[PDB]
Amino acid sequence: VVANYENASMAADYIKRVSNVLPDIGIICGSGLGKLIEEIEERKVIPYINIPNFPKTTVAGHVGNLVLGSVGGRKIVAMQGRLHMYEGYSNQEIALPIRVMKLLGVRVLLITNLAGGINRKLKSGDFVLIKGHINFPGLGLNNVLVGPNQDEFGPRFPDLSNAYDRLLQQLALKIAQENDFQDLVHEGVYAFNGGPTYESPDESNMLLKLGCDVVGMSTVPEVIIACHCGIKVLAVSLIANNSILDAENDVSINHEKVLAVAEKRADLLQMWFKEIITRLP
Amino acid sequence: VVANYENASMAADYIKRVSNVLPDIGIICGSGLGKLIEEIEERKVIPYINIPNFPKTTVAGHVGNLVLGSVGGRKIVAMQGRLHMYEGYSNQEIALPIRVMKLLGVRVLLITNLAGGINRKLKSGDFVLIKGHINFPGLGLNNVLVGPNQDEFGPRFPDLSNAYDRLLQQLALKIAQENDFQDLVHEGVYAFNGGPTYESPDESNMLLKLGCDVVGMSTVPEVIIACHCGIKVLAVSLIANNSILDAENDVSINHEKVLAVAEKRADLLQMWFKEIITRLP
Amino acid sequence: VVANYENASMAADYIKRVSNVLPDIGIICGSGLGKLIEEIEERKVIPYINIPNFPKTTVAGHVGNLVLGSVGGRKIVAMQGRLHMYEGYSNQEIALPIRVMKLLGVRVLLITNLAGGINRKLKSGDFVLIKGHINFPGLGLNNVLVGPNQDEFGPRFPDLSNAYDRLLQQLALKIAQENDFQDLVHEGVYAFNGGPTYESPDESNMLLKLGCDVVGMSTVPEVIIACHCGIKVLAVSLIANNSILDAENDVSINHEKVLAVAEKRADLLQMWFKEIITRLP
Numbered sequence: 001v002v003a004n005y006e007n008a009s010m011a012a013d014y015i016k017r018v019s020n021v022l023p024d025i026g027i028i029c030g031s032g033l034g035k036l037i038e039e040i041e042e043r044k045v046i047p048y049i050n051i052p053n054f055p056k057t058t059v060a061g062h063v064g065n066l067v068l069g070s071v072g073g074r075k076i077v078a079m080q081g082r083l084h085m086y087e088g089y090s091n092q093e094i095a096l097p098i099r100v101m102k103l104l105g106v107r108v109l110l111i112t113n114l115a116g117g118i119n120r121k122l123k124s125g126d127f128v129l130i131k132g133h134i135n136f137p138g139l140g141l142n143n144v145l146v147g148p149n150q151d152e153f154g155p156r157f158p159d160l161s162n163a164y165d166r167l168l169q170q171l172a173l174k175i176a177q178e179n180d181f182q183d184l185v186h187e188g189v190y191a192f193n194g195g196p197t198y199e200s201p202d203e204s205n206m207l208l209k210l211g212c213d214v215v216g217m218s219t220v221p222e223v224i225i226a227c228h229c230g231i232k233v234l235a236v237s238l239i240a241n242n243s244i245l246d247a248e249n250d251v252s253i254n255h256e257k258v259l260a261v262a263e264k265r266a267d268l269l270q271m272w273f274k275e276i277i278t279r280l281p
Numbered sequence: 282v283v284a285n286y287e288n289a290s291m292a293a294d295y296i297k298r299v300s301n302v303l304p305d306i307g308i309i310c311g312s313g314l315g316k317l318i319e320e321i322e323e324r325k326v327i328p329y330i331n332i333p334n335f336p337k338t339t340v341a342g343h344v345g346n347l348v349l350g351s352v353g354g355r356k357i358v359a360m361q362g363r364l365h366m367y368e369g370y371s372n373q374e375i376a377l378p379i380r381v382m383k384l385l386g387v388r389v390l391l392i393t394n395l396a397g398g399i400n401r402k403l404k405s406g407d408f409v410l411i412k413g414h415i416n417f418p419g420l421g422l423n424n425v426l427v428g429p430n431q432d433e434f435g436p437r438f439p440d441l442s443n444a445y446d447r448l449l450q451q452l453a454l455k456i457a458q459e460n461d462f463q464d465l466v467h468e469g470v471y472a473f474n475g476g477p478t479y480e481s482p483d484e485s486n487m488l489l490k491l492g493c494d495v496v497g498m499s500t501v502p503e504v505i506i507a508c509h510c511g512i513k514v515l516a517v518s519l520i521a522n523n524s525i526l527d528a529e530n531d532v533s534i535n536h537e538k539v540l541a542v543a544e545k546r547a548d549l550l551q552m553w554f555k556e557i558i559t560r561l562p
Numbered sequence: 563v564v565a566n567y568e569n570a571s572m573a574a575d576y577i578k579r580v581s582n583v584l585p586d587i588g589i590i591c592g593s594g595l596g597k598l599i600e601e602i603e604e605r606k607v608i609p610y611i612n613i614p615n616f617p618k619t620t621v622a623g624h625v626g627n628l629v630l631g632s633v634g635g636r637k638i639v640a641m642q643g644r645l646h647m648y649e650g651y652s653n654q655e656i657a658l659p660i661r662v663m664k665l666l667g668v669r670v671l672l673i674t675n676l677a678g679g680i681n682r683k684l685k686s687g688d689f690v691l692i693k694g695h696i697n698f699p700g701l702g703l704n705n706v707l708v709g710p711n712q713d714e715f716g717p718r719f720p721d722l723s724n725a726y727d728r729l730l731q732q733l734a735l736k737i738a739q740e741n742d743f744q745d746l747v748h749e750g751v752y753a754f755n756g757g758p759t760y761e762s763p764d765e766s767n768m769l770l771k772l773g774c775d776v777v778g779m780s781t782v783p784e785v786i787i788a789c790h791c792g793i794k795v796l797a798v799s800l801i802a803n804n805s806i807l808d809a810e811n812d813v814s815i816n817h818e819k820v821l822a823v824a825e826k827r828a829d830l831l832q833m834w835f836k837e838i839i840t841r842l843p
């Protein structure tokens with residue numbers, strides 16, 4: 001199924017009939033960082049499998065819902081169960097839910113992920129406000145926009161220089177200062193590693209030479225689809241480890257260690273993003 | 282449809298019957314840089330859609346013709362409407378028209394494109410004679426030759442060290458000097474960004490560290506198919522902007538600004554390439 | 563055909579019935595480096611085409627057998643006719659033979675290849691013990707594990723930091739010292755170029771800046787599938803040329819020159835790997 005205007009419209013029609021909510025804000029949350037979705041007020045939970053033209057996700061399994069309701073007095077829509085390109089989903093499958101958000105009325109998309117630290121100033125448990133990216137799949141002919149352009153959503157050749165909104169970054173930092181956890185908050189450039197292997201020690205050393213601050217396996221495809229159709233983005237990485245230190249010390253990362261960092265910061269990240277949603281212009 | 286010997290032969294048969302021209306030279310022109318094709322003498326215009334085994338292009342739309350005739354007393358064949366891999370065309374679709382050129386008798390391929398400047402010596406409106414390339418899709422398993430080898434055209438493992446003919450570069454520079462616009466002409470290494478997003482500010486900074494002089498979204502796939510089957514190549518980039526300066530100053534590029542640079546240099550590029558065609562050994 | 567547990571099991575069943583050998587060790591040999599396979603004792607030769615669910619290889623042609631028997635008193639299984647991703651094989655086709663090795667009982671995989679030298683200390687005819695890698699296809703969304711995870715074999719997010727076993731590297735070096743050819747043996751980081759074009763002169767210069775010691779078109783996909791399912795790996799490159807010197811001197815490489823280096827070192831490499839097999843813990 002192509003992520004075109006007609007197909008996204010049919011999905012938006014089903015959603016509008018079922019939910020009654022007109023959202024201004026969309027959220028996509030990283031693994032272990034989804035507790036806020038369970039606190040949406042007057043919620044409506046819509047399984048992906050029920051929505052016309054949504055991608056099939058039963059090979060991977062696990063949760064896959066769209067959730068609509070209110071947070072802090074604002075109308076939002078959340079994806080519960082993210083689609084990652086390392087699972088084998090196509091460009092069209094990743095893009096359709098973001099384009100449905102656009103047709104529903106979304107103007108701002110908030111995104112969190114888990115990532116590895118490259119910059120020597122980053123420690124496990126730190127947050128990074130993403131200010132730009134290096135898209136290795138995109139340089140190598142696997143950009144999320146490869147294919148026919150869908151003109152109703154955006155231009156054939158987009159400019160990504162303002163993909164990460166500067167005023168949203170400033171508001172996120174302001175709130176961290178108000179609650180005295182600004183010592184945990186950095187800014188940086190995100191490298192997209194297609195995955196699903198954690199980058200090797202020698203790949204990490206290469207990324208340090210190339211000016212990357214953090215590395216991960218998500219987020220950049222959604223950012224590019226959002227920028228293409230005029231949705232503003234704030235993206236925040238939670239740092240699981242420092243891959244450069246680990247390479248010097250011959251220490252390994254694993255998914256168990258990653259999820260333990262998620263649990264350590266989940267409640268603070270929930271409080272942070274609730275206040276960001278409440279304060280958005 | 283595979284770009285094999287039998288399929289390319291059927292297309293060359295149709296063309297020979299219809300056109301009566303036996304070309305020695307092929308040309309592929311960048312966007313806004315196609316005026317020379319409209320001045321081919323005793324022309325024959327052949328829509329792609331009419332030629333057996335040519336790739337289907339109706340999803341993208343816009344012009345798509347093969348044009349044969351004479352320029353400066355030389356027999357040429359031009360592609361009017363380029364195929365780009367960021368549109369979703371396969372390896373086989375890009376390669377077949379070049380292999381048809383080979384069977385028609387082409388020995389030299391002349392190529393122009395629009396590109397972004399990385400080297401700090403490059404300004405908008407400058408020309409770059411391409412002397413080598415960095416093929417990010419090719420390093421990442423999207424090389425145009427991935428697939429079975431077509432032995433009738435070339436070897437399984439080609440060497441690209443002489444892909445950009447040195448004597449053709451010298452002739453192009455000599456002609457610029459004769460007409461006193463050599464101050465506009467540079468040489469450089471071309472990075473292939475699969476596209477269709479313009480490279481991000483942080484991607485541009487990375488390319489500066491890696492020794493790239495210019496970046497664009499075309500040309501390298503055609504160069505590799507030509508080199509594989511023994512066709513000599515001259516490739517010239519027209520510089521739309523300097524991406525490094527733009528990143529320092531937070532200025533954006535867009536397709537409108539690019540086409541305006543094309544119009545500013547179109548007539549000089551037309552005159553230049555007409556003289557190159559006339560003077561080729 | 564997916565490289566899943568059921569499909570790999572059906573192939574392992576056929577093999578066990580036909581061969582009677584229970585192998586502990588697997589080998590994959592580079593081009594021109596396959597003489598050891600012809601000396602396996604009490605051999606059983608099984609054409610790929612006869613084995614349920616093995617990938618179809620008739621478009622490329624040439625040899626394709628699985629060979630089981632004894633070397634130095636140890637039970638082994640060899641692939642005679644390698645599958646390379648630049649031929650157009652999918653992730654699933656490359657992975658299935660390695661996962662069949664796992665089900666047959668393989669605990670150690672020994673791999674050889676031909677490669678280009680980047681590090682200035684490397685000459686034609688040298689050997690490199692691979693200690694880590696830079697996986698350009700993997701950074702760019704063509705990792706061999708992209709797709710659903712096959713949980714019976716390994717985890718969704720593998721760590722590759724110990725993919726190249728350190729004690730196996732030490733044993734290989736010890737044997738070189740015993741036979742007084744240690745002056746030929748180096749260690750280094752391997753860059754995976756998807757292929758099939760030899761890297762360009764400017765790509766080689768880029769790899770020198772990025773800390774790569776050698777470059778080639780194979781091996782990393784098999785290493786990653788082996789690491790994912792807990793098989794230890796030793797990988798050795800035979801150096802065909804130094805690509806950096808060749809770029810400075812405008813000298814070309816070609817497949818004929820590569821195979822001549824293979825023939826010069828084939829008998830010593832055969833003797834080396836026979837002793838490694840005999841001595842494995």
Ligand SMILES: Cc1cc(C(=O)O)c(C)n1C
Pocket residue numbers: 114115116117193195197198199215216217240241243253258
């Ligand atoms: C969470 C995570 C993702 C990655 C990546 O290579 O994409 C790494 C090293 N970590 C720790």
Ligand SMILES: Cc1cc(C(=O)O)c(C)n1C
Pocket residue numbers: 395396397398474476478479480496497498521522524534539
């Ligand atoms: C014309 C053009 C192409 C590209 C590219 O990233 O491929 C850029 C930055 N410009 C200006």
Ligand SMILES: Cc1cc(C(=O)O)c(C)n1C
Pocket residue numbers: 676677678679755757759760761777778779802803805815820
């Ligand atoms: C044997 C070989 C492979 C490669 C590669 O680019 O992958 C090179 C340069 N050589 C010499």
